[PDB]
């Protein structure tokens, strides 16, 4: 997966040629977003203050007799997306 | 506080009858222009007319922007004042007319009464109730209360890592949960806990506070076009995948108009029509002017002040169409033109003295006369800009005031536009292009 | 070994070379000649250091090779790293991601630094013994004890659960010199006072030790956080803004966000929380800006958050980009009225020779007096940059023939091998039909 | 904090794109992009041409009685 | 590699040890002065002490400018980065031209990282704690080491490790008979499956069973990794491998080049300096070759001034075959090579001359040797005469059609008749232009 | 029946009509005349087939209607479908998504085919029983028509089986190396007579033979396809959507190295092909500058080009060049000139077109049509062929006569007559 990167793929072990090709120095020169957040924690705490003047929920579509399958389908889609993605959004909690 | 180019302008310097005092509020001349700007200020304060456009016309250095900022100072900080440059309509995200419309709506403000519901106390019980709700117990110095909250609030509490003994702040309107710290009563249990302690809240568990919020129509449009108030996954997805501005539709603006009218009818909102200022109007193109026709003809639009120093100049976006101010005659028919005049040497000396006082510079009378003579040629801007370098020279030589020698030295060190033009003409073969 | 920074065009410029009275020395800190221009640059530098007047603009104008960029680099080196210095080219503002006005605004706001100074309680000591007791199975409350030592103190600390977790994550052992911030609980290891046990295997080569800290354990240290206005704007624009600090991709930041940030920074300044450190924006080759960018500059310099703007251009009376209007320096007269112009005079023979000597000293090249005379004659006839390039070329040619000092023969050899603009144009005229167009 | 915009429309509008199954053809017979990551070259080229069912086999299996119960494992 | 390209015969600059250019060596013929200058430039690149130096190769088309640049690249070797680039590439729909130029500049600066990776391989035979006869605290059991036995093809070793590894062993679920590797520089245990000798033919696991490691239990090697500053910049601007929502968005969204900021580049520069000071890395400044520089517009040329004035920039080689042409992006501004005089003042110009008929014949012979083509002397002379008119490229491009025609005719060499027939079949630029002029009414536009 | 491929402008061309000596026949494989041009095309085709030399450029130049696209289609037909032949027009490189140089790079890498060859051991059978004890350890029973065995499962195999919801009666294959399970179908029993079936379920016969099998897959992909596959996580979707963007050069270099490694290992073979750009004069000067150095790579195909321009203006410049192409690129390419056709050649082409369209014409009709084609243009006569056939069928005729040709000549105008009629009423038309 990491094609053309200083970071090597997950070599199974020293038996694989990729194990002896990449260095830890190259790995430590690339910072993941979590490492960036850990690096800017004090800056985030001190300098992130701008709030939108107004806050609203998204516009809602209302019909007297909607197709009874649209709303449950949207609810299931939202539930699955939340169950898969909300744990991954926890690092941005202080920013939010 | 740093001293900017217009830091001395505090007002229009008008008397009670509307006539312009000679030197007042950091303004020296332009009596007719100042009286016209006072009339415009009264028009803005009337809050009756919509989409009335004013053009400040005159050569550069005649204080058009100074007059606009003086209008702003006369109005006050409550009345919105959106300063935009004509070059700012050329965005790579939205169309130019969208930028103009957004700047139009930014000028209309709304003072709205709001009530905030607050749950604040030390957590004594955090019991999930199976989607799982939460039953929470909060204590303050005045009492204790138990609350049942939505699962979203429970998720927020988990994200804040709220546990029994932590002091928390909950805003019921926005569902915003903030963990402030572990209660001070537990600060003695350990020696190294890696915690920030906070005293027990001294009010009630449940509080209601009424506050005045200052918002604009543009803020409502943005909030309803890129929503982030649901705290759901879809809002986060939309924010992350679509961060660019969008062309807000007329339907959304009509809905916002209806909402604001309903708020005003309910008595909880007050409208402040406000002012839009476009400085380099000649930098707009013909499409922007054509849009501004209809935009000014709107009954919702604010008061727009235009400025221009161009003479008979070609309108941008046209091939060779030339108009008196860079503005097509159709838009000039919709504006009231305020004319600014060139300054006399006496007015130049007055402005130089005012700028010196603003920058905290002591200047001798001989130096003031020499610098006014320097300003008679070249420009007033150059003469004003020589004050600080001359002050630095005087400070280096140990003098607390500027003498004529310092002004002469500075003028020798730094050239003006005309001197540089002469140098370029004399040495055209040595410079590039 | 060669660092990432090597000998460049202006590597010999360490400052403006002025005395206390801002009187330029003939040859100091790399600068030679340009006395009036260096004095003006020193006055502008004093104005920057005072940091009281916002939105001052200076134009360095002169013929090519007269030291405009040299003067700018000298100003940058004399300012120091404490004061922001954003140097960009005029071409850099033309971007497919943001508007020209947005790019100029970002350039301005990268040149103003906001500094927050606060005092925090800090524990720094040598770990003597750490004990952590945790339940064997299931969720439970970990209990621990930590012993820290200095040259004059030793305290045993009872640890809370979160400090226990922090110590476990950092893998703190005996002999590690650690720093603990009481508020946030952050732990930073800065060395080992001694080695680990030798009998252990798979440990690796032990590095050098660190002396144990002295003084009291819990000290109070001043922590300084410095960011620019642009960084605040970017991290406040959106949730993912901190990544935009490195990837660019900021788009166009809303004016509401910038107004809020300006208000908040003014509030901090009034409340004594933060100090504003205005810097310089240097736009090289400002003639590449179009009329819209200049018009934006006109009013953007009128803000109290604007930095000092320094421009360099080598244009005479030239067409303004985006228009059909001829103007001095390629700049509209409205912007030229808002700025002071510093002219650079051409260099004489002795100034050229001194510049060549400084360049040779920078490049560690030894040259004879006759070679200096010939090179100065070439520089006067052709250009200064051609002579500067011939310095290194002749150094390499001399080293090839196992020599030690660059002679006139080496300079002649590189003059034959490498051509200036004039001789190249002559040879191209001699074979005009062979070249493709015109 | 503002309440959201409640946009009301005719219930018939939400069924504008809806087409009854008896009025539309199966578009899965042209689904090429759906096969990616799920269908292999082996299945298309080697297996299915050899092991496609026939009507005769289907009829024989349907008509034939249930197969005898599978014998229990015996340690032999 | 097996296919023969236009510069497949250029193996470097044919320079003597004293720098003088041999008449024909290393695939290059003539151009002695340009080759000597390029050798001086090669020495400049190898010295690694100069930054931002620019060289312009100026001459008529078909005079070896690209061949000279590729000869320079051959002289430097694969260790030194060499980033070829045409001027048209700065026009991108994703990033600005200055960003493309800056990225290619950072692509030309390479970094070589040398590290020693020490690992312990083996199949876990023994897992025994080392208890202490005096338990601390009186109760329970205390352990001071954990003995791990590792077995490989040609040995077996026991390792007395820190007690803290018991948690890593339990997390990895390491038991006897499993193959693991422990890294010295980190002190972590990784279970790379179970040994294959304990697998039966009736098992269905795929990645669980692994062969017994060959070689010694203790393996250490020196890893040399070559990276460029642009690689680090790109890996940090759009990071890959995170498990947060931003990495998921990056994976989902279409990849797009972005305008990398000076903050990230300064951080990368600081990290590179730290690595160099630690001795881990060695800086390898290479060359950026910008062919067809005249295709750059005025903005690119203006940016190149600041780019070359930097102290981190590589040595840039330009090439232009234009005369007094009009600079792109400007209205009726003419400069000697299509390049503004400000950028020409910052470059050293190397002149390439036209080739005499003898040099053309030599180059044709070299190309025939490279393409595996046997050509008779009379055919070679005729083809050189064809090259005296027309151009050199036409003559070197008639070699393979003539060889094919000879092979069809049943001959192993090109004779004169084959060259004559090929010349009749294929037209050059001048003959085609004459045809077009003679029939300008019948053609379009 | 009517298939999707119908009678077009070059449906009659099946090849270049050459013998073993590349000597063009007068009328063979649907091509008439253009002997020198066809011989040159055959030489270029032999050069393509050898594949030794990289980045060779040929320009087919001539007057409109002289057979340039005819010769290109003949080359494409004569070249096997095995060898890639990417035919694009010059206007197709102006994209809103990627630069012109990126478009040309993608076309170049689309013109080189890579034939891969993977041999893999698999287990193939019908599932009889799946027993899992407790998600820790379990057994799987698989059978064929001639075999049956039981397997011990691990944690990952059990997880993969549960994820795919493999149950009894399913016919599955398992890759031994990677453990991935794909479901081929399910067996049919008396109890599986479903009334409604899912969109992916299908009933297949139980496999025969041995439970362990070797799978050999041979497919041809291009370099551009591998680039798009490895550009992003699900890059193969862009091979359908086309939302590729600008692929990083580092990815392309990595893929070039990997392809060389495969070629050395015997797992892949390179088939360099042809990129035909028709009407190249639409390319800008930047595109020509990129083409100059793109042809110099070792992974560059044969570039065949076709223009009908005289000395005209290069797009993006104000300069005049013999074909609209700058002379630097023209020095890199061999020019094949096409001559105008004679009366005999025009009549033979008309006969071939009539045979292709299944139209019977009298000899007088052929004479009249040849005269019209010489007077106006060959394409006008070709269109009149079908027009006259339709008119003849309308009057219930069987052979096209001179009257039908005259009728369609009066009904449909060529450019000259239409221009004359417009000049007669010039003021009526807009913007003269
Ligand atoms: N009547 C005035 N009194 C005091 N200062 C003035 C006056 N007119 C202009 N100035 C000062 O001179 C400078 C030029 O004013 P500005 O409004 O920018 O000119 P214009 O808008 O006509 O280009 C400003 O810094 C302003 O503060
Ligand atoms: N007064 C000076 N002192 C020292 N070096 C100089 C001086 N003037 C020019 N140089 C050097 O000459 C080279 C070219 O001058 P530069 O400043 O680039 O000219 P320009 O003003 O056209 O930018 C630079 O490397 C610079 O360091
Ligand atoms: N002096 C030379 N010796 C050998 N081969 C040459 C020489 N000069 C040019 N060539 C070859 O002839 C062809 C002409 O291309 P080239 O001269 O490199 O174009 P440009 O002049 O644009 O660099 C190239 O393939 C090159 O390999
Ligand atoms: N040698 C030929 N043999 C058969 N048909 C031809 C020949 N030359 C041209 N044609 C026909 O003439 C028509 C126009 O020629 P074509 O090659 O397509 O365009 P052009 O040559 O004008 O670029 C085509 O329909 C083609 O079938
Ligand atoms: Mg400069
Ligand atoms: Mg055609």
PDB file of N, CA and C in Angstrom, chain F residues 203-240:
ATOM      1  N   UNK F 203     -26.553 -21.115  -8.986  1.00  0.00           N
ATOM      2  CA  UNK F 203     -26.365 -22.534  -8.732  1.00  0.00           C
ATOM      3  C   UNK F 203     -25.395 -23.113  -9.751  1.00  0.00           C
ATOM      4  N   UNK F 204     -24.378 -23.821  -9.259  1.00  0.00           N
ATOM      5  CA  UNK F 204     -23.348 -24.414 -10.098  1.00  0.00           C
ATOM      6  C   UNK F 204     -23.205 -25.887  -9.740  1.00  0.00           C
ATOM      7  N   UNK F 205     -22.634 -26.642 -10.673  1.00  0.00           N
ATOM      8  CA  UNK F 205     -22.352 -28.050 -10.441  1.00  0.00           C
ATOM      9  C   UNK F 205     -21.183 -28.216  -9.478  1.00  0.00           C
ATOM     10  N   UNK F 206     -21.214 -29.308  -8.723  1.00  0.00           N
ATOM     11  CA  UNK F 206     -20.103 -29.629  -7.841  1.00  0.00           C
ATOM     12  C   UNK F 206     -18.855 -29.881  -8.680  1.00  0.00           C
ATOM     13  N   UNK F 207     -17.709 -29.306  -8.318  1.00  0.00           N
ATOM     14  CA  UNK F 207     -16.500 -29.515  -9.121  1.00  0.00           C
ATOM     15  C   UNK F 207     -16.062 -30.970  -9.110  1.00  0.00           C
ATOM     16  N   UNK F 208     -15.432 -31.382 -10.204  1.00  0.00           N
ATOM     17  CA  UNK F 208     -14.907 -32.730 -10.338  1.00  0.00           C
ATOM     18  C   UNK F 208     -13.401 -32.722 -10.096  1.00  0.00           C
ATOM     19  N   UNK F 209     -12.780 -33.886 -10.263  1.00  0.00           N
ATOM     20  CA  UNK F 209     -11.339 -33.971 -10.149  1.00  0.00           C
ATOM     21  C   UNK F 209     -10.838 -33.976  -8.720  1.00  0.00           C
ATOM     22  N   UNK F 210      -9.745 -33.260  -8.482  1.00  0.00           N
ATOM     23  CA  UNK F 210      -9.026 -33.290  -7.220  1.00  0.00           C
ATOM     24  C   UNK F 210      -9.252 -31.981  -6.475  1.00  0.00           C
ATOM     25  N   UNK F 211      -9.267 -32.068  -5.144  1.00  0.00           N
ATOM     26  CA  UNK F 211      -9.568 -30.899  -4.325  1.00  0.00           C
ATOM     27  C   UNK F 211      -8.506 -29.816  -4.452  1.00  0.00           C
ATOM     28  N   UNK F 212      -7.247 -30.193  -4.642  1.00  0.00           N
ATOM     29  CA  UNK F 212      -6.181 -29.222  -4.843  1.00  0.00           C
ATOM     30  C   UNK F 212      -5.947 -29.003  -6.330  1.00  0.00           C
ATOM     31  N   UNK F 213      -5.952 -27.738  -6.743  1.00  0.00           N
ATOM     32  CA  UNK F 213      -5.857 -27.382  -8.149  1.00  0.00           C
ATOM     33  C   UNK F 213      -4.898 -26.212  -8.301  1.00  0.00           C
ATOM     34  N   UNK F 214      -4.353 -26.075  -9.504  1.00  0.00           N
ATOM     35  CA  UNK F 214      -3.482 -24.965  -9.861  1.00  0.00           C
ATOM     36  C   UNK F 214      -4.217 -24.031 -10.810  1.00  0.00           C
ATOM     37  N   UNK F 215      -4.195 -22.739 -10.501  1.00  0.00           N
ATOM     38  CA  UNK F 215      -4.881 -21.727 -11.292  1.00  0.00           C
ATOM     39  C   UNK F 215      -3.855 -20.881 -12.033  1.00  0.00           C
ATOM     40  N   UNK F 216      -3.955 -20.860 -13.358  1.00  0.00           N
ATOM     41  CA  UNK F 216      -3.077 -20.071 -14.213  1.00  0.00           C
ATOM     42  C   UNK F 216      -3.905 -18.983 -14.881  1.00  0.00           C
ATOM     43  N   UNK F 217      -3.516 -17.729 -14.676  1.00  0.00           N
ATOM     44  CA  UNK F 217      -4.230 -16.577 -15.216  1.00  0.00           C
ATOM     45  C   UNK F 217      -3.258 -15.775 -16.066  1.00  0.00           C
ATOM     46  N   UNK F 218      -3.615 -15.559 -17.329  1.00  0.00           N
ATOM     47  CA  UNK F 218      -2.830 -14.738 -18.243  1.00  0.00           C
ATOM     48  C   UNK F 218      -3.719 -13.610 -18.743  1.00  0.00           C
ATOM     49  N   UNK F 219      -3.280 -12.374 -18.525  1.00  0.00           N
ATOM     50  CA  UNK F 219      -4.037 -11.196 -18.917  1.00  0.00           C
ATOM     51  C   UNK F 219      -3.073 -10.119 -19.384  1.00  0.00           C
ATOM     52  N   UNK F 220      -3.567  -9.230 -20.236  1.00  0.00           N
ATOM     53  CA  UNK F 220      -2.781  -8.116 -20.748  1.00  0.00           C
ATOM     54  C   UNK F 220      -3.315  -6.822 -20.152  1.00  0.00           C
ATOM     55  N   UNK F 221      -2.443  -6.090 -19.462  1.00  0.00           N
ATOM     56  CA  UNK F 221      -2.759  -4.781 -18.915  1.00  0.00           C
ATOM     57  C   UNK F 221      -1.702  -3.803 -19.402  1.00  0.00           C
ATOM     58  N   UNK F 222      -2.045  -2.523 -19.378  1.00  0.00           N
ATOM     59  CA  UNK F 222      -1.111  -1.487 -19.786  1.00  0.00           C
ATOM     60  C   UNK F 222      -0.440  -0.866 -18.567  1.00  0.00           C
ATOM     61  N   UNK F 223       0.628  -0.108 -18.828  1.00  0.00           N
ATOM     62  CA  UNK F 223       1.314   0.589 -17.746  1.00  0.00           C
ATOM     63  C   UNK F 223       0.397   1.604 -17.085  1.00  0.00           C
ATOM     64  N   UNK F 224      -0.430   2.283 -17.879  1.00  0.00           N
ATOM     65  CA  UNK F 224      -1.351   3.262 -17.318  1.00  0.00           C
ATOM     66  C   UNK F 224      -2.337   2.598 -16.370  1.00  0.00           C
ATOM     67  N   UNK F 225      -2.775   1.382 -16.697  1.00  0.00           N
ATOM     68  CA  UNK F 225      -3.696   0.679 -15.813  1.00  0.00           C
ATOM     69  C   UNK F 225      -3.035   0.340 -14.484  1.00  0.00           C
ATOM     70  N   UNK F 226      -1.771  -0.088 -14.510  1.00  0.00           N
ATOM     71  CA  UNK F 226      -1.072  -0.376 -13.261  1.00  0.00           C
ATOM     72  C   UNK F 226      -0.858   0.902 -12.462  1.00  0.00           C
ATOM     73  N   UNK F 227      -0.567   2.007 -13.150  1.00  0.00           N
ATOM     74  CA  UNK F 227      -0.441   3.291 -12.470  1.00  0.00           C
ATOM     75  C   UNK F 227      -1.741   3.680 -11.785  1.00  0.00           C
ATOM     76  N   UNK F 228      -2.867   3.512 -12.475  1.00  0.00           N
ATOM     77  CA  UNK F 228      -4.149   3.886 -11.891  1.00  0.00           C
ATOM     78  C   UNK F 228      -4.498   2.954 -10.737  1.00  0.00           C
ATOM     79  N   UNK F 229      -4.151   1.671 -10.861  1.00  0.00           N
ATOM     80  CA  UNK F 229      -4.397   0.718  -9.782  1.00  0.00           C
ATOM     81  C   UNK F 229      -3.621   1.111  -8.534  1.00  0.00           C
ATOM     82  N   UNK F 230      -2.366   1.515  -8.700  1.00  0.00           N
ATOM     83  CA  UNK F 230      -1.505   1.807  -7.565  1.00  0.00           C
ATOM     84  C   UNK F 230      -1.491   3.285  -7.200  1.00  0.00           C
ATOM     85  N   UNK F 231      -2.335   4.099  -7.835  1.00  0.00           N
ATOM     86  CA  UNK F 231      -2.383   5.517  -7.497  1.00  0.00           C
ATOM     87  C   UNK F 231      -3.023   5.753  -6.136  1.00  0.00           C
ATOM     88  N   UNK F 232      -4.120   5.060  -5.841  1.00  0.00           N
ATOM     89  CA  UNK F 232      -4.821   5.231  -4.578  1.00  0.00           C
ATOM     90  C   UNK F 232      -5.304   3.872  -4.087  1.00  0.00           C
ATOM     91  N   UNK F 233      -6.015   3.887  -2.957  1.00  0.00           N
ATOM     92  CA  UNK F 233      -6.381   2.643  -2.287  1.00  0.00           C
ATOM     93  C   UNK F 233      -7.303   1.792  -3.150  1.00  0.00           C
ATOM     94  N   UNK F 234      -8.287   2.417  -3.787  1.00  0.00           N
ATOM     95  CA  UNK F 234      -9.191   1.705  -4.677  1.00  0.00           C
ATOM     96  C   UNK F 234      -9.068   2.266  -6.083  1.00  0.00           C
ATOM     97  N   UNK F 235      -7.831   2.413  -6.556  1.00  0.00           N
ATOM     98  CA  UNK F 235      -7.581   3.086  -7.815  1.00  0.00           C
ATOM     99  C   UNK F 235      -8.200   2.406  -9.015  1.00  0.00           C
ATOM    100  N   UNK F 236      -8.483   1.107  -8.919  1.00  0.00           N
ATOM    101  CA  UNK F 236      -9.117   0.413 -10.032  1.00  0.00           C
ATOM    102  C   UNK F 236     -10.475   1.001 -10.382  1.00  0.00           C
ATOM    103  N   UNK F 237     -11.113   1.718  -9.455  1.00  0.00           N
ATOM    104  CA  UNK F 237     -12.369   2.377  -9.787  1.00  0.00           C
ATOM    105  C   UNK F 237     -12.154   3.496 -10.795  1.00  0.00           C
ATOM    106  N   UNK F 238     -10.999   4.160 -10.737  1.00  0.00           N
ATOM    107  CA  UNK F 238     -10.702   5.201 -11.708  1.00  0.00           C
ATOM    108  C   UNK F 238     -10.475   4.635 -13.100  1.00  0.00           C
ATOM    109  N   UNK F 239     -10.174   3.341 -13.213  1.00  0.00           N
ATOM    110  CA  UNK F 239     -10.089   2.721 -14.527  1.00  0.00           C
ATOM    111  C   UNK F 239     -11.441   2.647 -15.215  1.00  0.00           C
ATOM    112  N   UNK F 240     -12.527   2.836 -14.469  1.00  0.00           N
ATOM    113  CA  UNK F 240     -13.873   2.956 -15.005  1.00  0.00           C
ATOM    114  C   UNK F 240     -14.336   4.405 -15.053  1.00  0.00           C
TER     115      UNK F 240
END
